[PDB]
Amino acid sequence: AIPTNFTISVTTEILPVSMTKTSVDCTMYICGDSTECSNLLLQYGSFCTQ
Amino acid sequence: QCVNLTTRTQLPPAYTNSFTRGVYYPDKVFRSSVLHSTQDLFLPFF
Numbered sequence: 001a002i003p004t005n006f007t008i009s010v011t012t013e014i015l016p017v018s019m020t021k022t023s024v025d026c027t028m029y030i031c032g033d034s035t036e037c038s039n040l041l042l043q044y045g046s047f048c049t050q
Numbered sequence: 051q052c053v054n055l056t057t058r059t060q061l062p063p064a065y066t067n068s069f070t071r072g073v074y075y076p077d078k079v080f081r082s083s084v085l086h087s088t089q090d091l092f093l094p095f096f
């Protein structure tokens with residue numbers, strides 16, 4: 001079976017390229033605005049540096 | 051027994067800048083080759 005005609009088909013495909021960049025502040029997330037809590041968070045500072 | 055001082059020539063209080071002065075060892079533990087973070091009563095820089 002040999003074709004005797006043709007069609008020019010345009011297909012659309014979508015690909016995600018990136019996602020929303022995000023940043024997090026340990027101090028104001030965990031220890032919202034209290035100094036007493038933020039002092040206790042210093043010993044865990046390494047974790048946030050991760 | 052005390053006596054006041056009378057020959058006084060006073061001016062307003064002069065101010066100067068603390069160039070990263072006033073730091074003290076926060077504890078009596080030997081630490082070497084390390085970056086240590088501490089929160090305490092410190093003289094703020096400048």
Ligand SMILES: *[C@@H]1O[C@H](CO)[C@@H](O)[C@H](O)[C@H]1NC(C)=O
Pocket residue numbers: 052053054
């Ligand atoms: C001068 O000395 C007396 C006591 O020695 C004291 O009572 C007085 O307050 C002094 N003068 C001033 C202005 O303080």
